[PDB]
Amino acid sequence: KRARVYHLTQVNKRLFSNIRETIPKYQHCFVFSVDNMRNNYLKDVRHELNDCRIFFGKTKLMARALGTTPEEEQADGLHRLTRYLTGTVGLLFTNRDPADIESYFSNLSQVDFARAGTVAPRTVTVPPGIVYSTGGEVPPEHDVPVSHTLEPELRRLGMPVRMIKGKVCLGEGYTICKEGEVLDSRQTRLLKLFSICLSEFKVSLLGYWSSASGEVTELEAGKTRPKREGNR
């Protein structure tokens, strides 16, 4: 019979240390917030910014790596940068000019199918009459009628569509979702069926610390964002 520590020791045979190793090597550390971060997108950002180091882990861990107080900070003034570390954020260490970083992320975007829980960025309404395969997302002349395969599926999901002259038809139109509404599983299913991508990957720079000054430069997105409250 063995003590738990024996068990733990045999099993015992990362982010915090990597961040601390990285701090001395870069002119700037940015905090960024992200919408619709996906593994592939992070890999692509890392590859394109191959001269930068990007961290995206537990926020509490990243904050402690940097140091949240003047006593614990790993570089002069760095504790003030930790004030941004709330919600879905990451760190970006770089020797690039801040305008270059701003330029890169202002143009960076990609779209995906929204998942349940996401807030709809816009209202989506399928127009009356013949139902097209993207439900009006694409102009009709560029689209094709929706497959009759989907007609009972569409009805199961709440759309009052009918069969008219061999084509799926509405009859006002049908609103799948309204702007600012939280999407549920039924709605995200309907959106995916029409190939409508309501989810957009987007990075916002909140602010950055600079080694040259030991000061934090606050950017617009960082101004109205809630700040970190110390845990201890």
Side-chain angles (χ1 to χ4, degrees):
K1 59 195 316 189
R2 300 165 176 284
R4 174 165 177 78
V5 288
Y6 180 83
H7 160 76
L8 291 178
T9 281
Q10 308 297 66
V11 168
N12 195 79
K13 305 174 177 185
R14 233 157 280 184
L15 182 59
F16 187 85
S17 285
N18 285 350
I19 288 168
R20 294 200 165 177
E21 172 186 331
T22 296
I23 293 165
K25 298 173 176 177
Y26 291 90
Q27 295 291 334
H28 302 297
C29 180
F30 284 80
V31 176
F32 61 92
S33 73
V34 280
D35 289 338
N36 188 41
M37 178 78 99
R38 308 229 167 172
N39 291 341
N40 288 350
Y41 301 160
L42 174 56
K43 285 212 162 56
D44 291 350
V45 175
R46 282 181 172 145
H47 180 68
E48 286 167 31
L49 300 183
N50 67 297
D51 58 341
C52 306
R53 302 293 181 261
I54 295 160
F55 294 99
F56 189 67
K58 199 169 181 295
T59 315
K60 194 185 198 180
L61 197 51
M62 300 196 295
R64 300 263 174 90
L66 295 182
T68 54
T69 66
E71 297 79 11
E72 296 169 331
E73 58 182 14
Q74 296 298 290
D76 163 42
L78 193 53
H79 79 278
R80 297 189 178 85
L81 190 65
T82 68
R83 300 164 176 176
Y84 293 117
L85 294 177
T86 58
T88 309
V89 290
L91 298 180
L92 190 154
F93 290 92
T94 183
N95 289 313
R96 282 158 186 233
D97 188 82
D100 180 78
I101 296 302
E102 169 167 333
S103 183
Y104 177 79
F105 290 111
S106 63
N107 196 50
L108 179 68
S109 70
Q110 184 55 285
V111 300
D112 259 313
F113 298 139
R115 302 164 187 186
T118 295
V119 163
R122 53 179 161 110
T123 295
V124 175
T125 302
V126 178
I130 299 180
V131 180
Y132 288 82
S133 81
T134 66
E137 185 74 350
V138 169
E141 69 273 21
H142 290 267
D143 209 352
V144 94
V146 69
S147 192
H148 61 74
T149 286
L150 300 180
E151 188 242 336
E153 175 71 0
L154 290 168
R155 276 199 285 106
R156 179 191 71 86
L157 292 169
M159 291 191 69
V161 291
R162 296 187 170 193
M163 284 303 306
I164 299 180
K165 296 174 301 180
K167 289 181 178 56
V168 179
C169 296
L170 274 179
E172 74 311 317
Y174 182 86
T175 296
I176 294 175
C177 56
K178 302 176 179 180
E179 183 180 335
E181 160 173 33
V182 166
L183 293 164
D184 60 25
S185 187
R186 184 186 59 84
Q187 303 173 290
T188 59
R189 180 58 173 177
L190 277 169
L191 292 164
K192 282 188 255 267
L193 289 173
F194 288 112
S195 291
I196 295 180
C197 302
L198 284 195
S199 179
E200 178 181 28
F201 159 74
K202 164 200 307 182
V203 172
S204 298
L205 303 167
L206 305 184
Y208 60 95
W209 171 90
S210 303
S211 191
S213 57
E215 291 186 9
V216 169
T217 300
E218 186 162 275
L219 300 173
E220 277 300 317
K223 278 151 196 178
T224 48
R225 205 170 177 273
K227 306 274 143 48
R228 186 169 184 283
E229 191 168 349
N231 285 70
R232 292 172 275 181

